[PDB]
Amino acid sequence: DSPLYPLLSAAAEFYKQALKSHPARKAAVNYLKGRGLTGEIARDFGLGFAPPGWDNLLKHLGGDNLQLKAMLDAGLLVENSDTGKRYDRFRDRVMFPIRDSRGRIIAFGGRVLGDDKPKYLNSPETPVFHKGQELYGLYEARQKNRDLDEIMVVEGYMDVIALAQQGIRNAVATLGTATSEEHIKRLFRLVPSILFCFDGDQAGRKAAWRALESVLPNLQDGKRVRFLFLPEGEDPDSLVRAEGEDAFRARITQQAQPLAEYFFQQLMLEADPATLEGKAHLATLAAPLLEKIPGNNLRLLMRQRLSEITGLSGENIGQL
């Protein structure tokens, strides 16, 4: 219970109250209406509106220099570290408040309603917001279902919101970060099954391997992890609005790839085990990764597949 929480909470109350009754609301409300995000979904995710300009939240919250430092530390202001000039971090944007386990607003995402870049702006790291520990939408998914079987991990705010609007309400998002081991530990405390969904771009494919590396040291027996790769140029946002819930669920069932198949596929592309050298190279890449799996059956199962492909024993694999 620190002083950043009330400021963040007041900021959120400001941003959604402007979404309702602010002069510039037209562009914002049209985005939400233009995506079916009105009413139900907007309330579930506390959507708001940051009006255009430099100091709307500043001139609305104010405070002495100690309050101002707390707004900066909460990520609500940007300060020029040379001149001290300060202004709202989030300007002319649709606002996505981020909540922790207890429902407390800890940070914000914002989508631009103009031409200024970046289209999506995250909060910086703050004492109440750590990007490697938090997942956007985790609070909202736990509210919708207390006994979740599976969590879907996606890359962006609108992926979570678009999916929720289509009836897929167990999606959470990393916040422009690689999935961390701490992310995996929190997900596995809630569900035995994680479905990763990656955009059709090179950053999506790189993020899948980093996600697999975060998963391995936390992969106990009886857990289930899969990777769904979307067609080039797509993300869950665009895709699910295009083809709808039923088709996206069919796509998952059809095309989600098991972790173990993704693991051996990618490594066999790096080290082709047709030859004696490729077999040794493949075992040299795989073994240190497999050694980290804590689940004893799964570690044995992956070692066994590696042995079948490479013809190398454990003594061979160890000595290599």
Side-chain angles (χ1 to χ4, degrees), residues 77-84 86-101 103-115 118 120-143 145 148-205 207-209 211:
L77 311 182
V78 159
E79 181 186 56
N80 188 296
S81 85
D82 275 13
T83 61
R86 70 180 89 96
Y87 42 89
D88 294 3
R89 174 169 195 94
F90 296 101
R91 311 176 291 282
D92 184 43
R93 294 178 181 269
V94 182
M95 285 296 120
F96 310 97
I98 297 152
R99 312 204 264 295
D100 64 14
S101 294
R104 295 169 302 172
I105 302 94
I106 58 175
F108 290 91
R111 180 191 187 266
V112 69
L113 285 151
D115 280 332
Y120 286 86
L121 179 63
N122 304 312
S123 303
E125 215 78 353
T126 76
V128 303
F129 175 63
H130 292 140
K131 267 180 280 296
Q133 292 180 47
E134 308 300 340
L135 292 173
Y136 180 77
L138 182 54
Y139 174 82
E140 289 84 349
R142 291 203 68 175
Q143 298 293 111
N145 184 9
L148 272 181
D149 302 330
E150 186 170 87
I151 300 262
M152 190 185 183
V153 181
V154 299
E155 289 174 87
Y157 301 96
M158 273 298 311
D159 300 321
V160 169
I161 272 145
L163 291 157
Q165 201 273 343
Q166 284 299 295
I168 296 168
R169 294 188 205 85
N170 64 337
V172 308
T174 57
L175 287 180
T177 62
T179 303
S180 70
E181 296 194 29
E182 251 295 315
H183 288 141
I184 304 305
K185 293 182 225 154
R186 297 186 74 226
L187 292 173
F188 278 154
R189 278 168 217 148
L190 304 171
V191 292
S193 168
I194 299 174
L195 171 61
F196 286 95
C197 180
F198 299 103
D199 302 346
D201 53 33
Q202 194 53 9
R205 296 177 273 289
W209 190 257

Side-chain angles (χ1 to χ4, degrees), residues 4 66 68-77 124-128:
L4 309 198
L66 279 182
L68 291 176
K69 181 172 185 294
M71 296 174 56
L72 170 62
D73 290 341
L76 303 164
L77 311 182
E125 215 78 353
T126 76
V128 303

